[PDB]
């Protein structure tokens, strides 16, 4: 239920990489659709390479699966100056292990100790069983592949892009389009 200026994101100078995976970036004004959800998170720069349609590895298999048939887009930008700390900004959390492979758009927030091969386990994470949650200690001195990137995903009726309007020429023979009605004529101020 809003008009979505999506191409202004694509034309802005701040973002480091942006791509779309069911749509071209010039058609981002022409889109109209029922509902969408926007996603956001902070991740390491070389691991953003997993955050495209259908891919494998770490985030894509154990946190956040994108499908090969993703009608959507992803936008990513460097964030050292706010999202890294000299002591390592361990507030950001990632999953290293989980059974099965995630369904596209699947989320999980529960955890149990991983028990690879076969063993019982009740805390401690000592031998053959592992706590799967880990923290990302981002530091302002990291090499580019380990620097923090701010990342957004767009999961493409109520939401058309911006409907462009021209100047309005009066007293002349003109072709015209007013909302959805088209014609040709002379336009004059009525009483």
């Amino acid at each position: 239920n809003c008009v979505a200026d999506y191409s202004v994101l694509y034309n802005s100078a701040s973002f480091s990489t942006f791509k779309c995976y069911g749509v071209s970036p010039t058609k981002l004004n022409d889109l109209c659709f029922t509902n969408v959800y926007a996603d956001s998170f902070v991740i390491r720069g070389d691991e953003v390479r997993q955050i495209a349609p259908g891919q494998t590895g770490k985030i894509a298999d154990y946190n956040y699966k994108l499908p090969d048939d993703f009608t959507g887009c992803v936008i990513a930008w460097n964030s050292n100056n706010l999202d890294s700390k000299v002591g390592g900004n361990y507030n950001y959390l990632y999953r290293l292990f989980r059974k099965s492979n995630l369904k596209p758009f699947e989320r999980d927030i529960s955890t149990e100790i991983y028990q690879a091969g076969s063993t019982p386990c009740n805390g401690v994470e000592g031998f053959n069983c592992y706590f799967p949650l880990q923290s990302y200690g981002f530091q302002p001195t990291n090499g580019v592949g380990y620097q923090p990137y701010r990342v957004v995903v767009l999961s493409f009726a109520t939401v058309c892009g911006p409907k462009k309007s021209t100047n309005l020429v009066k007293n002349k023979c003109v072709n015209f389009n007013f909302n959805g009605l088209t014609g040709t004529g002379v336009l004059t101020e009525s009483n």
Binding site: L96, G126, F127, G137, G143
Partner: protein, 593 residues
């Protein structure tokens, strides 16, 4: 079963790198800002790093290595599961630590008193080594050389006779039959098919290559003797071994300081570019950017940007307490940086090519697992730096990078003046480098007993190096321990293998570069294949073994010395005309006293 071992080491690789980072951050901050407040910080960070590392080792030990199939996970289990230390009983561990601390304090604080004037005393580096490097009074040197041994070296005797026990009991407890076999273990390779390698085979291949050096060394020795006979007349026989106090430092480890006494053509000035560096008014930034211009010219990667903000290349503007020791840092998290105290000199320009050549290694394997981000053996990690030094020392690079004028000229008298200074450094040390490891290998196995230690040492100085005791020694002395590499617990075979590999790594890329002359004249600039055949090995680290890595660069399944000897065929061509009336090699039986 393997997924337990994979998930356990995947967790090590995600856990460890953070702790490695905030340990090495305090160590970086200490070395650039030296304060007790940063010493205590780097101590208490390094403590928590070790307390993690040793715990993860006893966890890795529960996983049976015979349940593994994959090669990667196997080498990372074997790197973390290894004891080494902590196999000793707690008292014997502290006794070894007590001996190590005692040999460390003896070597670092060892004063030598002047018998002409007892109120003046010298430490080793700030005075006693200076005599050996830059004085020509035979008796002042002989005093400095024998007084290091008698007033300091003697202190290490009763300690080395007990270090050799506790280190062998440590090796044995690990099922390495001696501590020499334990140090040889770096070069070992297993289960890779064909490219496997043995601890004992390292002895056989060092001794199979050493005899190819001897015909060159016995001409270079007879030449260095024929020149030392003019600097030290009546003291030296025309056929003799060389008196050890005349070899240019406290042990005779390199002949490079004998140049001014030994030079082929003292009437021709050997090349420099320190003048062109100050004529263009270069700084550390320019020197290292001209090095990055060399690296992008062969076509290796650029720096990761953060190298320039986070490295230190000159001293600070403050009269800040910081170490001037040029050091390559990999901190983890992709953070590569150099720390040094640089000064505008062509030696520092070669340094820049060398230390950025170390960072190109640290950078290339950075996608490999953390337990695997190291040199394929301890000789590779310096040989990969020194090829970038040697390519940059050439008159072709120096003229084409604009450091020599277009109308500067070079001649055959200049070519031999360079090659002899290379040989006094590269060839003269190889006998010593084989000899020191061989003596230690034979001590740790017990082929030399404690009642023949100093006896066999000097019999080997006379048989391998052609060098004679200036003054008699017996089993009250410890001349091996009077050197840093013995008293502070360092393996030394890395220098032999590196001094082989440097010339293999050179000639492999000289073929790729279409090089047209003698091996020293080679430059790997503007080329693609010379960067590409190298990058195939540089991306490995430890993730594939050195025996296989040599086949990717050179096409050799094992180490060779031919390439080194080919870098000296033009100098041997000159020695064969100079030395015709010389006694080639030496009489082992002569003595100066």
């Amino acid at each position: 079963i393997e997924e337990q071992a994979k998930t356990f080491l995947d967790k090590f690789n995600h856990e460890a790198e953070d702790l490695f980072y905030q340990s090495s951050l305090a160590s970086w901050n200490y070395n650039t800002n030296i304060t007790e407040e940063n010493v205590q910080n780097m101590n208490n960070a390094g403590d928590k790093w070790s307390a993690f590392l040793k715990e993860q080792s006893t966890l890795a030990q529960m996983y049976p290595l015979q349940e593994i199939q994959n090669l990667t996970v196997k080498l990372q289990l074997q790197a973390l599961q290894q004891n080494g230390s902590s196999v000793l009983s707690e008292d014997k561990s502290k006794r070894l630590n007590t001996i190590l601390n005692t040999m460390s304090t003896i070597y670092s604080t060892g004063k030598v008193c002047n018998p002409d004037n007892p109120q003046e005393c010298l430490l080793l580096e700030p005075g006693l080594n200076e005599i050996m490097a830059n004085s020509l009074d035979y008796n002042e040197r002989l005093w400095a050389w024998e007084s290091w041994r008698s007033e300091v070296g003697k202190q290490l005797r009763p300690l080395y006779e007990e270090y050799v026990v506790l280190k062998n009991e440590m090796a044995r407890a690990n099922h390495y039959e001696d501590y020499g076999d334990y140090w040889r273990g770096d070069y070992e390779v297993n289960g890779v098919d064909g490219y496997d390698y043995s601890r004992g085979q390292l002895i056989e291949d060092v001794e199979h290559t050493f005899e190819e050096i001897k015909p060159l060394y016995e001409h270079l020795h007879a030449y260095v003797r024929a020149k030392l006979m003019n600097a030290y007349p009546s003291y030296i026989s025309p056929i003799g071994c060389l008196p050890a106090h005349l070899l240019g430092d406290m042990w005779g480890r390199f002949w490079t300081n004998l140049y001014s006494l030994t030079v082929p053509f003292g009437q021709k000035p050997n090349i420099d570019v320190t003048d062109a560096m100050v004529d263009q008014a270069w700084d550390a930034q320019r020197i290292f950017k001209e090095a990055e211009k060399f690296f992008v010219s062969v076509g290796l990667p650029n720096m990761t940007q953060g190298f320039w903000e986070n490295s230190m290349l000159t001293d600070p503007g403050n009269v800040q307490k910081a170490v001037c020791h040029p050091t390559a840092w990999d901190l983890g998290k992709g953070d590569f940086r150099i720390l040094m105290c640089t000064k505008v000199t062509m030696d520092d320009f070669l340094t820049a090519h060398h230390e950025m050549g170390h960072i190109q290694y640290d950078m290339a394997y950075a996608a490999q697992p953390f337990l695997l981000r190291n040199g394929a053996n301890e000789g590779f990690h310096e040989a990969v730096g020194e090829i970038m030094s040697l390519s940059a020392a050439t008159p072709k690079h120096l003229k084409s990078i604009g450091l020599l004028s277009p109308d500067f000229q070079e001649d055959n008298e200049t070519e031999i003046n360079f090659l002899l200074k290379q040989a006094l450094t590269i060839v003269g040390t190889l006998p010593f480098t084989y000899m020191l490891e061989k003596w230690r290998w034979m001590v740790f196995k017990g082929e030399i007993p404690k009642d023949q230690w100093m006896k066999k040492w000097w019999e080997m100085k006379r048989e391998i190096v052609g060098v004679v005791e200036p003054v008699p020694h017996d089993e009250t002395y410890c001349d091996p321990a009077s050197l840093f590499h013995v008293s502070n617990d360092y393996s030394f075979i890395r220098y032999y293998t590196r001094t082989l590999y440097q010339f293999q790594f050179q000639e492999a890329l000289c073929q790729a570069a279409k090089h047209e002359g003698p091996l020293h004249k080679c430059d790997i600039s503007n080329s693609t294949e010379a960067g590409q055949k190298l990058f195939n090995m540089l991306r490995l680290g430890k993730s594939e073994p050195w025996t296989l890595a040599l086949e990717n660069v050179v096409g050799a399944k094992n180490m060779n010395v031919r390439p080194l000897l080919n870098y000296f065929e033009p100098l041997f061509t000159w020695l064969k005309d100079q030395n015709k009336n010389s006694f080639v090699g030496w009489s082992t039986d002569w003595s100066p006293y």
